[PDB]
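From the pipeline queue, job 12 of 40. The input is one protein chain; the requested action is below.

Action: predict structure.
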Amino acid sequence: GSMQIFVKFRTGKTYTLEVEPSDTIENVKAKIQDKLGIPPDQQRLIFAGKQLEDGRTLSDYNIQKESTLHGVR
């Protein structure tokens, strides 16, 4: 399956991203690189005050459709 989330950067810019529940966090970082040109080695992803850890999945963190991730490069 699929869902649309948001990724919000410290600049205020917020982008849509199309993910799957099964996706690992490092897979999400790969999608960000495809859309925005930020390599995964310059990304950290935060949901609701926790840093998302690469080897876990979105579903492991209770990410819902239309949730917003904050990123730090």
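Job complete. The helical segments are 25-36.
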